Design an enzyme around this catalytic site. Structure first.
Site, PDB file in Angstrom:
ATOM      1  N   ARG A  34      -0.247   2.799   2.512  1.00  0.00           N
ATOM      2  CA  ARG A  34      -1.275   2.508   1.511  1.00  0.00           C
ATOM      3  C   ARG A  34      -2.699   2.466   2.113  1.00  0.00           C
ATOM      4  O   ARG A  34      -3.633   2.757   1.424  1.00  0.00           O
ATOM      5  CB  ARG A  34      -0.964   1.232   0.716  1.00  0.00           C
ATOM      6  CG  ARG A  34       0.067   1.397  -0.442  1.00  0.00           C
ATOM      7  CD  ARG A  34       0.222   0.067  -1.201  1.00  0.00           C
ATOM      8  NE  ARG A  34       1.441  -0.632  -0.818  1.00  0.00           N
ATOM      9  CZ  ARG A  34       1.598  -1.954  -0.701  1.00  0.00           C
ATOM     10  NH1 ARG A  34       0.600  -2.809  -0.874  1.00  0.00           N
ATOM     11  NH2 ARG A  34       2.777  -2.421  -0.376  1.00  0.00           N
ATOM     12  N   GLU A  66       9.941 -10.452   6.798  1.00  0.00           N
ATOM     13  CA  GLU A  66      10.909 -11.335   6.113  1.00  0.00           C
ATOM     14  C   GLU A  66      12.383 -10.978   6.490  1.00  0.00           C
ATOM     15  O   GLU A  66      12.998 -10.082   5.882  1.00  0.00           O
ATOM     16  CB  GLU A  66      10.679 -11.297   4.587  1.00  0.00           C
TER      17      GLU A  66
HETATM   18  N1  AMP Z   1       1.805  -9.356  -2.835  1.00  0.00           N
HETATM   19  C1  AMP Z   1       1.657  -8.129  -2.298  1.00  0.00           C
HETATM   20  N2  AMP Z   1       1.244  -7.066  -3.024  1.00  0.00           N
HETATM   21  C2  AMP Z   1       1.122  -5.844  -2.516  1.00  0.00           C
HETATM   22  N3  AMP Z   1       1.358  -5.572  -1.212  1.00  0.00           N
HETATM   23  C3  AMP Z   1       1.779  -6.553  -0.373  1.00  0.00           C
HETATM   24  C4  AMP Z   1       1.954  -7.927  -0.875  1.00  0.00           C
HETATM   25  N4  AMP Z   1       2.381  -8.701   0.148  1.00  0.00           N
HETATM   26  C5  AMP Z   1       2.445  -7.881   1.235  1.00  0.00           C
HETATM   27  N5  AMP Z   1       2.083  -6.610   0.918  1.00  0.00           N
HETATM   28  C6  AMP Z   1       2.033  -5.426   1.810  1.00  0.00           C
HETATM   29  O1  AMP Z   1       2.742  -5.711   3.030  1.00  0.00           O
HETATM   30  C7  AMP Z   1       1.833  -5.414   4.087  1.00  0.00           C
HETATM   31  C8  AMP Z   1       1.096  -6.657   4.476  1.00  0.00           C
HETATM   32  O2  AMP Z   1       2.040  -7.526   4.984  1.00  0.00           O
HETATM   33  P1  AMP Z   1       1.497  -8.486   6.097  1.00  0.00           P
HETATM   34  O3  AMP Z   1       1.914  -7.712   7.341  1.00  0.00           O
HETATM   35  O4  AMP Z   1       2.383  -9.676   5.820  1.00  0.00           O
HETATM   36  O5  AMP Z   1       0.014  -8.639   5.946  1.00  0.00           O
HETATM   37  C9  AMP Z   1       0.713  -4.563   3.580  1.00  0.00           C
HETATM   38  O6  AMP Z   1       1.110  -3.196   3.660  1.00  0.00           O
HETATM   39  C10 AMP Z   1       0.569  -5.034   2.159  1.00  0.00           C
HETATM   40  O7  AMP Z   1       0.027  -3.909   1.442  1.00  0.00           O
END
Ligand code: AMP
Lengths: 179, 179
Positions: free
Chosen positions: B66, B103
């Site tokens: 994304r 997770e």
């Molecule tokens: N609530 C959410 N909505 C959309 N994308 C999410 C969400 N939570 C995590 N992500 C996606 O998971 C990745 C971020 O996870 P993190 O590594 O935990 O920051 C990114 O690619 C985000 O686009």
């Protein structure tokens, strides 16, 4: 180098034996890395699309994942929106989905049911046309939303894999061809 | 950034309990579909970056997948190239990779060995910052190439997950914030 087509062409990097022995992979990474060659690539695709459809495109459809590097920038150059066709699981809300062949197995792509209204005119973009699996799946999904697929485009086409035949009757354009 | 920012905020759509219960998914798809929203999001990121770093940025780095939707358009707007950070196994040639926690279990990212030279200054982009695991891992990859990460940016930040803390001392900017 000089010309825009040769600027793109010198920035497609060849990698023999990736991902498997005997294949020659075409890496678009250098095109993105050089701002002059990225703009040359977008401008070539844009000029093709403007000349061919005269401004009458509603959306670009970007194909997960490498197509996402070109779709938005192409769309913006043309003054259009970009819709997303993604690997199964990636989009929230109601979807349509279509299977296709991926390496030794099977995979699926999806689109949101409200991504397009009926009769919208769409051009699908990806970096590279190889087997034509994802691109063909993409066309299936768009037809199901009653979208008019004007054509599919890529920067690179691998002609020995015959992915273009797989798309007919949908027209296909590539900037550069290799086996 | 009132009017321009509202054009972005209006196009972020939320989906409760996707992909799993108790997660509110933030979907940036409508931002891409509306060319004025897309242009506003890119302009607001570029404006912040130029007002903070001036002409010191060498490269944008887009996060698979994304982040690919925004990196090239942001780099083009800044007159810079864009380099790629991918899920492991997707990039050809010599690479550096790392694992990080998600997770339950592990995920893996990689970068091409010659993406950047030492001392080159990079801004990382993804669509959304949650726990910061992914962006942190990208920062670590870039460090291993002796790049200087000036900043990470996104459209959305989920502030209860404290992704900003994980990235410190690398600064972090988001267009919009939610718990
Ligand atoms: N609530 C959410 N909505 C959309 N994308 C999410 C969400 N939570 C995590 N992500 C996606 O998971 C990745 C971020 O996870 P993190 O590594 O935990 O920051 C990114 O690619 C985000 O686009």
């Amino acid at each position: 180098a000089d010309s825009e087509l040769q600027l793109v062409e010198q920035r497609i990097r060849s990698f023999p034996d990736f991902p498997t022995p005997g294949v020659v992979f075409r890496d678009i990474s250098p095109v993105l890395k050089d701002p002059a060659s990225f703009r040359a690539a977008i401008g070539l695709l844009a000029r093709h699309l403007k000349a061919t459809h005269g401004g009458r495109i509603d959306y670009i459809a970007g194909l997960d994942s490498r197509g996402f590097l070109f779709g938005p920038s192409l769309a913006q150059e043309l003054g259009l929106g970009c819709v997303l066709i993604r690997k199964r699981g990636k989009l929230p809300g109601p979807t349509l989905w279509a299977s296709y062949s991926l390496e030794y197995g099977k995979a699926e792509l999806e689109i949101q049911k409200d991504a397009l209204e009926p009769g919208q005119r769409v051009v699908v973009v990806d970096d590279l046309l190889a087997t034509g699996g994802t691109m063909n799946a993409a066309c299936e999904l768009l037809g199901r939303l009653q979208a008019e697929v004007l054509e599919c485009v890529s920067l690179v086409e691998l002609t020995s894999l015959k992915g273009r035949e797989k798309l007919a009757p949908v027209p296909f354009f590539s900037l550069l061809q290799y086996e």
